[PDB]
Design an enzyme around this catalytic site. Structure first.
Site, PDB file in Angstrom:
ATOM      1  N   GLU A 138      32.378  47.137  44.170  1.00  0.00           N
ATOM      2  CA  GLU A 138      31.725  47.820  43.722  1.00  0.00           C
ATOM      3  C   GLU A 138      29.909  47.098  44.539  1.00  0.00           C
ATOM      4  O   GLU A 138      29.819  45.974  44.290  1.00  0.00           O
ATOM      5  CB  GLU A 138      30.862  48.387  42.588  1.00  0.00           C
ATOM      6  CG  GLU A 138      32.491  49.040  41.667  1.00  0.00           C
ATOM      7  CD  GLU A 138      32.288  49.065  40.809  1.00  0.00           C
ATOM      8  OE1 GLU A 138      31.301  48.898  39.964  1.00  0.00           O
ATOM      9  OE2 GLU A 138      33.332  49.723  39.723  1.00  0.00           O
TER      10      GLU A 138
ATOM     11  N   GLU B 249      36.422  47.417  33.991  1.00  0.00           N
ATOM     12  CA  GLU B 249      35.403  47.225  32.909  1.00  0.00           C
ATOM     13  C   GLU B 249      36.008  47.234  31.637  1.00  0.00           C
ATOM     14  O   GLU B 249      35.051  47.370  31.067  1.00  0.00           O
ATOM     15  CB  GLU B 249      34.410  47.599  32.966  1.00  0.00           C
ATOM     16  CG  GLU B 249      33.145  47.751  34.650  1.00  0.00           C
ATOM     17  CD  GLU B 249      31.974  48.428  34.495  1.00  0.00           C
ATOM     18  OE1 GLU B 249      31.337  48.399  35.311  1.00  0.00           O
ATOM     19  OE2 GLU B 249      32.307  49.621  34.681  1.00  0.00           O
TER      20      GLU B 249
END
Ligand SMILES: O[C@@H]1[C@H](O)[C@@H](O)OC[C@@H]1O
Ligand SMILES: [Mg+2]
Ligand code: NA
Ligand code: NA
Lengths: 211, 210
Positions: A145, A69
């Site tokens: 994820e 991220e």
């Protein structure tokens, strides 16, 4: 990167490892403000290069990751290529800036759904089944994820596994995540309890989102 | 007097095993055509475009039969309604092809068309191409013609594109069938079929299987 013993145990018990550089810049606006900035390339490069120099002999490590991220910036592309040159033996992945950028060998979205598109501007999360066959796309897809296991969760987990088994290029994923990040506090009587965000006077906090 | 002996079955039948009524006969039009000795024997029309379709080139290859003569010409003219938009005239004799020369019996005309009206099922814009075979000095030997739709069909990056845009085929297979006349087709039935398809949001048809 993990405690050095982790890899040893994975080598011996047998688990495939994604080893991931210590780079996350989630809170920046936009996410890639630092990672697209050449002044932050030296600090980022040491986080990737020294990881590889450390862990490159462990058989359990099968994929390198550029971090987490931090949008997608030119520094990712530079470091993607660095690893490819130094270690042709393992694929490189990175989810930032849309999960399918030039900095990744693997389409590795987070929380892309099985059948339902989430067409966010600039960084859409396509249905994983759809994502695979987008015009010109050829890479495998492994979710970095998925199935966010927060509290009473994992609803629709079976929908993923049905899709994984049916589609050759859907090669699975990593659940988010293994263990609750709750901490122990003790009450007036010495009785232990499980604490989350805010229970230490920490503020601002994000409450139970650590679990 | 014509005499036609039609066989129901032949070795051709091994390649005609479509799922449909098995019939026989002279079931399409019969006609007589008169062509001059010096004649247009074949012609091909192509249309290619620049990147945003604001310019096209119409390329017409024309083949003749009969005696080759220096005075022979082909004129291909392009019509939008009653307006001529483009024209080209050239003698026979194509470009060199190999060590033995070129086709002395062929010529290729290239017409420039600015901002062409493009053909599609959404808007079936058509032009008229007229192919005149003639003497240089102005005597028409014969003319052939066709409807020309300016469009590009290509596959790019895994997508079927028409005029640069991805198609969505709302299609149907259609056999040539009439409950009274069998496999003989007529204008009225054909027109009826097309009007119903378009009224029901079809934009494509497959000639199943012939
Ligand atoms: O026979 C027809 C067609 O030609 C075939 O391809 O599929 C079945 C249909 O009814
Ligand atoms: Mg059949
Ligand atoms: Na699979
Ligand atoms: Na969390």
């Amino acid at each position: 990167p993990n405690h050095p013993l982790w890899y040893t145990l994975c080598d011996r018990y047998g688990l495939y490892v994604v080893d991931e550089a210590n780079i996350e810049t989630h809170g920046m606006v936009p996410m890639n403000r630092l990672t697209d900035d050449p002044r932050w390339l030296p600090a980022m490069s040491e986080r990737v290069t020294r990881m590889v120099q450390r862990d490159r002999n462990h058989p359990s490590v099968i994929i390198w990751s550029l971090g987490s991220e931090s949008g997608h910036g030119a520094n990712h592309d530079a470091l993607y290529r660095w690893i490819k040159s130094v270690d042709p033996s393992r694929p490189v992945q990175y989810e930032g800036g849309g999960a399918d950028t030039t900095a990744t060998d693997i389409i590795c979205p987070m929380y892309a759904r099985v059948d339902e598109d989430q067409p966010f501007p600039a960084v859409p999360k396509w249905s994983i089944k759809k994502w695979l066959s987008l015009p010109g796309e050829t890479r495998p897809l492994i979710l970095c994820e998925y199935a966010h296991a927060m509290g009473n969760s994992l609803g629709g987990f079976a929908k993923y596994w049905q899709a994984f088994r049916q589609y050759p290029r859907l090669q699975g994923g990593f659940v988010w995540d293994w263990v609750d990040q709750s901490l122990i506090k003790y009450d007036e009587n010495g009785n232990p309890w499980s604490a989350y965000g805010g229970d230490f006077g920490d503020t601002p906090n994000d409450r139970q989102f650590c679990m | 007097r014509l005499a036609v002996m039609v066989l129901r079955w032949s070795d051709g039948s091994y390649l005609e095993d479509q799922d449909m009524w098995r019939m026989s006969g002279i079931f399409r039009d019969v006609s007589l055509l008169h062509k001059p000795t010096t004649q247009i024997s074949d012609f091909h029309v192509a249309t290619r475009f620049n990147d945003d379709f604001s310019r096209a080139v119409l390329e017409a290859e024309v083949q003749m039969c009969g005696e080759l003569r220096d005075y022979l010409r082909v004129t291909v003219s392009l019509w939008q309604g009653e307006t001529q938009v483009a024209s080209g005239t050239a003698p026979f004799g194509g470009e060199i092809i190999d060590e033995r020369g070129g086709y002395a019996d062929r010529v290729t005309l290239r017409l420039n068309v600015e901002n062409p009206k493009l053909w599609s099922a959404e808007i079936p814009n058509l032009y008229r191409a007229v192919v005149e075979l003639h003497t240089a000095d102005g005597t028409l030997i014969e003319a052939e013609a066709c409807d020309v739709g300016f469009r590009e069909v290509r596959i790019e990056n895994g997508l079927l594109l028409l005029n640069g845009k991805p198609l969505l085929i709302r299609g149907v297979n259609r056999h040539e069938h009439h409950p009274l006349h069998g496999q003989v087709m007529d204008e009225q039935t054909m027109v009826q079929d097309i009007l119903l398809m378009k009224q029901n949001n079809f934009n494509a048809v497959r000639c199943s299987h012939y």
